[PDB]
Amino acid sequence: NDSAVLFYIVASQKKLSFDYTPNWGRNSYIDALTFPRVLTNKPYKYRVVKAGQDLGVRDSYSVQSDGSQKVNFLEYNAGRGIADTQTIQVYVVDPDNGNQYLVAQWK
Amino acid sequence: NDSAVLFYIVASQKKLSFDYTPNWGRNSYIDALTFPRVLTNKPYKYRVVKAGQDLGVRDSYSVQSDGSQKVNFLEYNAGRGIADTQTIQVYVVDPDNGNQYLVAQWK
Amino acid sequence: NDSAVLFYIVASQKKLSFDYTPNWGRGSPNSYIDALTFPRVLTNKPYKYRVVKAGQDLGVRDSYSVQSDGSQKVNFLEYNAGRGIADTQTIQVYVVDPDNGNQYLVAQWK
Amino acid sequence: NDSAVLFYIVASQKKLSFDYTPNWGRGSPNSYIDALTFPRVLTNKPYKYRVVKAGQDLGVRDSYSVQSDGSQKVNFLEYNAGRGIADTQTIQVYVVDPDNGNQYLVAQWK
């Protein structure tokens, strides 16, 4: 029963809206990923892990006016897109302590 | 640093929008309270505590179409409104285990 | 997967040890539960307990002092008018946060 | 007030005991940190550790077996090419969740 955790957020945030349903971008490559509504309380960076291989952190793109934010894999895979044959994992990085939390995954 | 808790919700909910900024309803009485956007994953009941005195739980009103939900204190104070001289506390009640979590307070 | 919440506690507490394995105490006659004891209880706050007997809220009472072996005992006689609770009813014991009044279920009998 | 998260752990774990008080191990010469030891570590999963030395990610290695007294030791020599880390750099030790790959800071040196 996770509701104590749920309402702890509600207690501390009061009002909060987020969408991390991922919008992956294609031909047999995944070039990027977009989140419709990201959290903005901190300047979060992102880490991409490609089929188990860690591509590191890069600095985030700006958050859009409709609240969306884009993670472009080309800045992470040295200019190449990633083949859908591989699994991809996208972590939010906490700029204060460097913690990272999985927020998206591809097969 | 509460962000691990924050992104645990994000992990498990992906998409989630809530507003518990309270809209208290008045002449020197607080008749009710409204939340603009409540959580709906469970049929949550509400408990009202009046200046330290516990008024118990009652069954919730339906959630509106714009996502709002109203807590009417008259069903809790035996028909009387509550005087603003008193502090009021409104708890969400988890219908599975009966846990309760403070979500609103008046002076 | 809730390891994030777990290690959020670990980072904030660094060192923490608890045991809320319920130890149900029987009265006289045996078919009466008159207490609950926890081997090790969190002590960062003076927590309180609420007992709910077969749907009926017996209310909140201040919690007995913590024992030297870290244990604490909820005495049902304080909540149920000097009688223990028949062991056919379901009993629920909530921990009450003295600061905000939140309550969290920690023990339940049938 | 985060007692809700706390008692969410208590309800799920019932019984739990940990100590991540860092015990920094010095090498030769003394001005080198070559290990970190934790007196009691969570064992519900085979956790892994990542060391970050003065901003440089030394990566993830599998964690030494847990000792009989519940303790576990992160050996920096495994991450830093057989040399210990100069105690003027800041060292960060993250716990890695083997299931999803999340990482949580548990220790930090200056």
Inspect the interface and report whether the beta carbons of C11 and D105 lie closer than 8 Å.
Answer: yes
C29 upstream amide cis, omega within 30 of 0: yes
Q: Which stretches of chain B sit within 8 Å of chain D by CB?
A: 2, 4-5, 101
Collapse the DSSP code of D10 into the 3-class scheme (helix H, G, I; strand E, B; otherwise coil) and give the result.
Answer: helix
CA proximity to D49, closest of D61, D38, D39: D61
Strand (E) or helix (H) holding B68: none
Q: CA end-to-end span of chain B, whole Å?
A: 27
C-alpha angle with apex C3: C1 to C8, nearest 5 degrees?
140
Burial label for A48, CB within 10 Å (0-12, 13-18, 19+), is buried
- The identity of residue A49, as a single letter, is V
C-alpha angle with apex B71: B69 to B76, nearest 5 degrees?
160
Entry resolution in angstroms?
2.8
* Residue reference for tokens 């040196």: D109
Q: Taking a C-beta distance cutoff of 8 angstroms, is the pair C104, C94 a contact?
A: yes
Cα-based distances in Å from A48 to A90, A107, C53: 5, 14, 52
Helices (H), strands (E): how many in chain B?
1, 10
Tokens (6 digits) for A100: 């990272």
Q: Which of A4, A91, A100 sits opposite D7 (nearest CB)?
A: A4
Contacts of B101 in chain D (CB under 8 A): 4
Signed CA dihedral, D11, D13, D17, D23: sign only: negative
Contacts of A5 in chain C (CB under 8 A): 2, 5
Return d(Cα B6, Cα A103) in angstroms, integer.
Answer: 12
Q: What is the CA radius of gyration of chain D?
A: 15
Return d(Cα D98, Cα D102) in angstroms, integer.
Answer: 8
Inspect the interface and report whether the beta carbons of D94 and A91 lie closer than 8 Å.
Answer: no
Burial label for B76, CB within 10 Å (0-12, 13-18, 19+), is buried
Three-state helix/strand/coil letters over chain A: CCHHHHHHHHHHHCEEEEECCCEEECCCEECEEEECECCCCCCCEEEEEECCEEEEEECCCCCCCCCCEEEEHHHCCCCCCEECCCCEEEEEECCCCCCEEEEEEEC
Inspect the interface and report whether the beta carbons of C5 and A4 lie closer than 8 Å.
Answer: no
Tokens (6 digits) for C103: 């309550």
Per DSSP bridges, beta strands D32-38 and D23-26 are antiparallel
**Residue range of the domain that includes B35:** 1-107
D29 upstream amide cis, omega within 30 of 0: yes
β-strand partners of A90: A48, A104
β-strand partners of C88: none
Return d(Cα B28, Cα D67) in angstroms, integer.
Answer: 65
CA count, 13 A, side-chain hemisphere, B21: 5
Domain count, chain B: 1
- The identity of residue D2, as a single letter, is D
Helices (H), strands (E): how many in chain C?
2, 9
Residues in contact with B93: Cβ distance below 8 Å, sequence separation at least 6, in sequence order: B44, B45, B46, B47, B57, B99, B100
- Residue B37 is given by DSSP the state B
Contacts of A100 in chain D (CB under 8 A): 101-103
Collapse the DSSP code of C58 into the 3-class scheme (helix H, G, I; strand E, B; otherwise coil) and give the result.
Answer: strand
Strand segments, DSSP code E, in D1-110 are 15-19, 23-26, 32-38, 48-53, 56-62, 72-75, 85-86, 91-96, 103-109
Burial label for D7, CB within 10 Å (0-12, 13-18, 19+), is buried
CA distance D56 to chain B (A): 23
Collapse the DSSP code of B32 into the 3-class scheme (helix H, G, I; strand E, B; otherwise coil) and give the result.
Answer: strand
Q: Which stretches of chain B sit within 8 Å of chain A by CB?
A: 1-12, 14-21, 37, 39, 42, 92, 94, 96-97, 99, 101-103
Strand (E) or helix (H) holding B100: strand B100-106
Which long-range contacts does C58-63 make (Cβ < 8 Å, 24+ apart)?
C59/B54, C60/C96
CA distance A61 to chain B (A): 19
β-strand partners of D15: C19
Return d(Cα B96, Cα B80) in angstroms, integer.
Answer: 30
Q: Which residues of C3-14 are buried (b: 16+ CB within 10 A; e: fewer)?
A: bbbbbbbbbebe
Tokens (6 digits) for B81: 């409104």
Return d(Cα D46, Cα D48) in angstroms, integer.
Answer: 7
Strand (E) or helix (H) holding C56: strand C56-62
β-strand partners of B46: B58, B92
- Residue D84 is given by DSSP the state P
Cα-based distances in Å from D43 to C3, D20, D59: 12, 13, 21
Return d(Cα C52, Cα C87) in angstroms, integer.
Answer: 13
Sheet strands side by side (includes D56-62): A53-58, A45-50, A88-93, A100-106, D103-109, D91-96, D48-53, D56-62
Residues in contact with A12: Cβ distance below 8 Å, sequence separation at least 6, in sequence order: B2
Cα-based distances in Å from A22 to A19, A69, B104, C77, D55: 8, 10, 33, 55, 30
Per DSSP bridges, beta strands D23-26 and B100-106 are unpaired
Q: Taking a C-beta distance cutoff of 8 angstroms, is the pair B47, B54 a contact?
A: yes
CA count, 13 A, side-chain hemisphere, D67: 10
CA proximity to A29, closest of A87, A82, A107: A82
CA proximity to D57, closest of C50, A54, A52: A54
Chains that touch D (3 or more CB pairs under 8 A): A, B, C
Q: Taking a C-beta distance cutoff of 8 angstroms, is the pair D51, D91 a contact?
A: yes
Q: Taking a C-beta distance cutoff of 8 angstroms, is the pair A4, D4 a contact?
A: yes
